[PDB]
């Protein structure tokens, strides 16, 4: 009996609810699972006369518990939204039995430990949000082999490199912000199809920007700020025909910012502050345009306010890194 399997799953989960501030699971009683708050039923995909539990949505219920193995009984679930709860521990391996999983959002919880690799077992997975937890360690390179549309990893404790496989991803949005990723951006980044938004804010990346970034002609948001990149901006960035938001602040870039970049047609906010640029085109100057916002604070530019001192600048400016 199929809904009985859902009943057992949900009652095993409610037993694990230590604190439910909005009494969200109050009506989780009796065998009518479809009337449980946060449980969403639907016709079976292969038979519209059968009733199945197809979705779970407890977004913002602030529930402190964990996810028990018995949730593996919810074999018809394709939607799982538990943003902003206090679910703790790990994702049960039994969730590999949720073969219809399509959108999995455990953002802003108390999950911990290695990347939840059970997500790799879902053949229909499209949306994976694990941001704002305490996942850590290496990132499984095979994650970019799935046909995900959206990968949110930001604000965890992931470490080591961005996988060379990133160029395989079909994602329209990928976030890495606020982890402890290190090393270079892989040259394969140019091969990402469908990519619109990529966010690296606040990691420990370094090396030079790969010129292959210029192949991302559908990108609207490219934010590499608060890392440790060096070298010059690649001239290939003139290929970012769609970029709207571009942020390189808080790095160690050197050299010239040209109108190759500052006159990109959709570029409306270009932040390159806290670097060591020693020249900029006139069309890169903040306050110069009514359509385009620029920010050049704390660089090495003559005749601009709030620049770095000449004492601090000459050592770095006179020893540019050979991107090789």
């Amino acid at each position: 009996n199929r809904l009985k399997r859902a009943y057992i799953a949900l009652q095993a989960w409610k037993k694990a609810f230590y604190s439910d501030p909005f009494n969200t699971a109050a009506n989780w009683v009796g065998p009518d699972v479809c009337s449980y708050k946060g449980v969403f039923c639907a016709p079976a995909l292969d038979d519209p006369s059968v009733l199945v539990v197809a979705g779970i949505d407890l977004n913002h219920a602030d529930i402190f518990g964990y996810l028990p193995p018995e949730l593996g009984l919810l074999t018809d679930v394709a939607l799982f939204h538990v943003n902003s709860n206090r679910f703790c521990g790990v994702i049960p391996k039994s969730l590999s039995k949720l073969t219809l999983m399509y959108e999995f959002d455990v953002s802003n919880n108390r999950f911990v430990g290695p990347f939840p690799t059970v997500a790799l077992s879902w053949p229909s997975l499209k949306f994976l949000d694990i941001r704002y937890n305490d996942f850590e360690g290496k990132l499984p390179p095979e994650i970019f082999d799935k046909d995900l549309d959206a990968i949110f990893l930001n604000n965890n404790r992931f470490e080591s490199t961005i996988p060379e496989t990133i160029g395989k991803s079909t994602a329209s949005v990928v976030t890495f912000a606020h982890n402890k990723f290190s090393g270079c951006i892989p040259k394969t980044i140019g091969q990402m199809k469908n990519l619109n938004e990529i966010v690296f804010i606040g990691n420990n990346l370094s090396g030079c920007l790969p010129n292959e970034i210029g192949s991302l002609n559908n990108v609207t948001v490219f934010d590499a700020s608060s890392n440790g990149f060096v070298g010059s901006l690649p001239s290939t960035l003139s290929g970012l025909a769609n970029v709207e938001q571009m942020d390189f602040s808080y790095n160690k870039f050197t050299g010239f910012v040209t109108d190759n970049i500052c006159k990109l047609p959709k570029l409306s906010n270009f932040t390159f502050s806290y670097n060591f640029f020693n020249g900029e085109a006139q069309s890169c100057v903040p306050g110069s345009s009514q359509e385009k916002q620029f920010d050049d604070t704390s660089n090495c530019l003559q005749n601009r306010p709030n620049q770095k001192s000449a004492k601090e600048c000459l050592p770095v400016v006179s020893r540019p890194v050979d991107c090789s």
């Binding site: 939607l79 943003n83 959002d105 949005v173 912000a177 938001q245």
Partner: protein, 47 residues
């Protein structure tokens, strides 16, 4: 003028406020089927 890659930086933000709906189908419909989608790239239907 909002980007979901940037909104992802707010821990409380989700793509859709309608409980039970796909992030790929945040549109008032007579029924509430989690299997129902329609949007292809989340960046496009987020706006």
């Amino acid at each position: 003028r909002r980007y979901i890659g940037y909104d992802a930086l707010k821990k409380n933000n989700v793509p859709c406020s309608r409980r039970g709906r796909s992030y790929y189908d945040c549109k008032k419909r007579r029924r509430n089927n989690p299997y129902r989608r329609g949007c292809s790239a989340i960046t496009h239907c987020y706006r």
